[PDB]
Design a protein around this motif. Structure first.
Motif, PDB file in Angstrom:
ATOM      1  N   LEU A  85       0.797  -1.069  -0.178  1.00  0.00           N
ATOM      2  CA  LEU A  85       0.377   0.014  -0.409  1.00  0.00           C
ATOM      3  C   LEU A  85       1.232   0.921   0.251  1.00  0.00           C
ATOM      4  O   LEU A  85       1.776   1.480   0.833  1.00  0.00           O
ATOM      5  N   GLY A  86       0.810   1.932  -1.558  1.00  0.00           N
ATOM      6  CA  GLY A  86       1.718   2.684  -1.060  1.00  0.00           C
ATOM      7  C   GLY A  86       2.959   2.384  -2.717  1.00  0.00           C
ATOM      8  O   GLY A  86       4.186   1.974  -1.883  1.00  0.00           O
ATOM      9  N   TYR A 145      -1.743  -0.916  -4.247  1.00  0.00           N
ATOM     10  CA  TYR A 145      -2.914  -0.016  -4.173  1.00  0.00           C
ATOM     11  C   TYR A 145      -1.963   1.440  -4.276  1.00  0.00           C
ATOM     12  O   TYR A 145      -1.460   1.653  -2.699  1.00  0.00           O
ATOM     13  N   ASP A 146      -2.024   2.644  -4.932  1.00  0.00           N
ATOM     14  CA  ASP A 146      -1.498   3.846  -4.740  1.00  0.00           C
ATOM     15  C   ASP A 146      -2.814   4.239  -5.350  1.00  0.00           C
ATOM     16  O   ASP A 146      -3.176   4.389  -6.617  1.00  0.00           O
ATOM     17  N   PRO A 147      -2.911   5.402  -4.786  1.00  0.00           N
ATOM     18  CA  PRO A 147      -4.393   6.569  -5.412  1.00  0.00           C
ATOM     19  C   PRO A 147      -3.688   7.633  -7.070  1.00  0.00           C
ATOM     20  O   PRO A 147      -4.391   7.874  -7.644  1.00  0.00           O
ATOM     21  N   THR A 183       3.055   4.826   3.014  1.00  0.00           N
ATOM     22  CA  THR A 183       1.984   5.623   2.319  1.00  0.00           C
ATOM     23  C   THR A 183       3.156   6.971   3.960  1.00  0.00           C
ATOM     24  O   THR A 183       3.518   6.429   4.353  1.00  0.00           O
ATOM     25  N   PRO A 184       2.502   8.481   3.417  1.00  0.00           N
ATOM     26  CA  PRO A 184       3.139   8.982   4.652  1.00  0.00           C
ATOM     27  C   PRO A 184       1.605   8.558   5.347  1.00  0.00           C
ATOM     28  O   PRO A 184       0.445   8.113   5.512  1.00  0.00           O
ATOM     29  N   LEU A 244      -1.524  10.637   6.826  1.00  0.00           N
ATOM     30  CA  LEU A 244      -2.542  11.624   6.171  1.00  0.00           C
ATOM     31  C   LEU A 244      -3.814  11.049   6.948  1.00  0.00           C
ATOM     32  O   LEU A 244      -3.949   9.635   7.253  1.00  0.00           O
ATOM     33  N   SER A 295      -6.293  10.046   5.088  1.00  0.00           N
ATOM     34  CA  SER A 295      -6.763   8.997   3.998  1.00  0.00           C
ATOM     35  C   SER A 295      -5.877   7.608   4.576  1.00  0.00           C
ATOM     36  O   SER A 295      -6.270   6.543   4.058  1.00  0.00           O
ATOM     37  N   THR A 296      -4.872   8.127   4.957  1.00  0.00           N
ATOM     38  CA  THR A 296      -3.835   6.900   5.460  1.00  0.00           C
ATOM     39  C   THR A 296      -3.377   6.562   7.178  1.00  0.00           C
ATOM     40  O   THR A 296      -3.567   5.630   7.084  1.00  0.00           O
ATOM     41  N   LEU A 331      -5.960   3.006   8.165  1.00  0.00           N
ATOM     42  CA  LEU A 331      -6.259   2.297   6.792  1.00  0.00           C
ATOM     43  C   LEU A 331      -6.171   0.824   6.970  1.00  0.00           C
ATOM     44  O   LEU A 331      -6.898   0.079   6.547  1.00  0.00           O
TER      45      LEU A 331
HETATM   46  C1  LIG Z   1      -4.927   5.922   0.739  1.00  0.00           C
HETATM   47  O1  LIG Z   1      -3.537   5.615   0.052  1.00  0.00           O
HETATM   48  C2  LIG Z   1      -3.259   6.216  -0.313  1.00  0.00           C
HETATM   49  C3  LIG Z   1      -2.999   8.141  -0.161  1.00  0.00           C
HETATM   50  C4  LIG Z   1      -1.613   8.884  -0.356  1.00  0.00           C
HETATM   51  C5  LIG Z   1      -0.328   7.883  -0.548  1.00  0.00           C
HETATM   52  N1  LIG Z   1       0.436   8.797  -1.194  1.00  0.00           N
HETATM   53  C6  LIG Z   1       0.846  10.052  -1.172  1.00  0.00           C
HETATM   54  C7  LIG Z   1       2.523  10.102  -0.938  1.00  0.00           C
HETATM   55  O2  LIG Z   1      -0.421  11.100  -1.582  1.00  0.00           O
HETATM   56  C8  LIG Z   1      -0.330   6.577  -1.126  1.00  0.00           C
HETATM   57  C9  LIG Z   1      -1.201   5.912  -0.068  1.00  0.00           C
HETATM   58 CL1  LIG Z   1      -1.615   3.963  -0.868  1.00  0.00          CL
END
Ligand SMILES: COc1ccc(NC(C)=O)cc1Cl
Ligand SMILES: COc1ccc(NC(C)=O)cc1Cl
Lengths: 195, 195
Positions: free
Chosen positions: A52-53, A75-77, A108-109, A111, A113-114, A117
């Motif tokens: 993931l990333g 997975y990577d968005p 991943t960073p 964030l 969204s992560t 996760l």
């Molecule tokens: C929700 O998954 C992600 C969210 C962000 C990133 N990478 C960056 C650099 O933003 C990678 C993944 Cl897998």
């Protein structure tokens, strides 16, 4: 960047340590024991690793683990599926990833969204016995969900280099027999340090 | 054969554990400690791995560790240099190998000619700080010599799956801070077992 290969290498090490329980086996030996049946392992060849990333560290992890015959999916968005294909990683949507993986590693960073996760919901979509690595950022893997997955056997083991708090105040995860851990050693090589 | 990959994978795990001290870090963490300076590591990329014994297991080790950017050199009195070249290993005479190696791994049978292959004499010819793996047969590495090399720092660490006596009656090696070990887990995977 300079430290991308140090991180990737630690992550590969952790995957091998989960497969063969080397840290637990060493502790067993150092406590004067000889416990062969207890530390029966798993072969990496033919197993599926989810990444993931798919940035630099994730890609380096992939190509290493491909040499062990692991199937690498991920997975990577941001990264396109044809780009990831060019370094051997099959990209899928997150919902498709969980049920295929024997091992999951995060790159991943931290964030919104992560954060969490991997959580109670996503562990419930994993194959029973999944092994999980976090050498990226503390909190990507929800620590309470991880503990509950380890206690039920949904997760057969975990390797953690990072924690939500460092050093971690909560001890439950560290202390679990199927958890291996390091004090945030990802960048801690002579080479990464001394440019 | 069926178990060649199982052995090669354990070996590569042990190499990564020597480079990053994952088993010792885990034990530190489980004792409630957070010891970042203590477990400063080494990057594998660019380092030289010496493989003594270039049969199936040694070759599988070689190709896995090539993916990390290790330079793979080795010795075998029976395998032809052209065969070893095909899987990326530069064959050299034994006397040339010792001084070059950052890591040495053994993959030979136990014969008179391989008993104590690593001994006081050959440790003296190694690069200071060499790290050594034996996941092959107990006795290839002379256990007293290995202990003396660890105590001087000639050898910076060792990973042992196998011992002259099993379980080992002498505890000095197991108990050393820079020795990682397993109770003869080389073939102990579900896959090797259940053909
Ligand atoms: C929700 O998954 C992600 C969210 C962000 C990133 N990478 C960056 C650099 O933003 C990678 C993944 Cl897998
Ligand atoms: C002198 O060292 C050796 C002696 C014998 C072998 N191999 C076999 C299959 O006999 C390998 C080595 Cl490295």
């Amino acid at each position: 960047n300079g430290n991308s290969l140090s991180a990737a290498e630690l992550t590969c090490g952790m995957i091998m340590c989960l497969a063969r329980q080397i840290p637990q086996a060493t502790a067993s030996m150092k406590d004067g024991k000889w416990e062969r049946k207890k530390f029966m392992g798993t072969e990496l060849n033919g197993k599926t690793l989810g990444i993931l990333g798919l940035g630099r560290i994730g890609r380096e992890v992939a190509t290493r683990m491909q040499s062990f015959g692991m199937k690498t999916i991920g997975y990577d968005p941001i990264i396109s599926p044809e780009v990831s294909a060019s370094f051997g990683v099959q990209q899928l949507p997150l919902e498709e990833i969980w049920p295929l993986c024997d091992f999951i590693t995060v790159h991943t960073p931290l964030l919104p969204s992560t954060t969490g996760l991997l959580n109670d919901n996503t562990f419930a979509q994993c194959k029973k016995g999944v092994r999980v690595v976090n050498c990226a950022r503390g909190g990507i893997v929800d620590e309470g969900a991880l503990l509950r997955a380890l206690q039920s056997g949904q997760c057969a083991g975990a390797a953690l280099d990072v924690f939500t708090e460092e050093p971690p105040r909560d001890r439950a995860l560290v202390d679990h027999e199927n958890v291996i851990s390091c004090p945030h050693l990802g960048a801690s090589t002579k080479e990464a340090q001394s440019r």
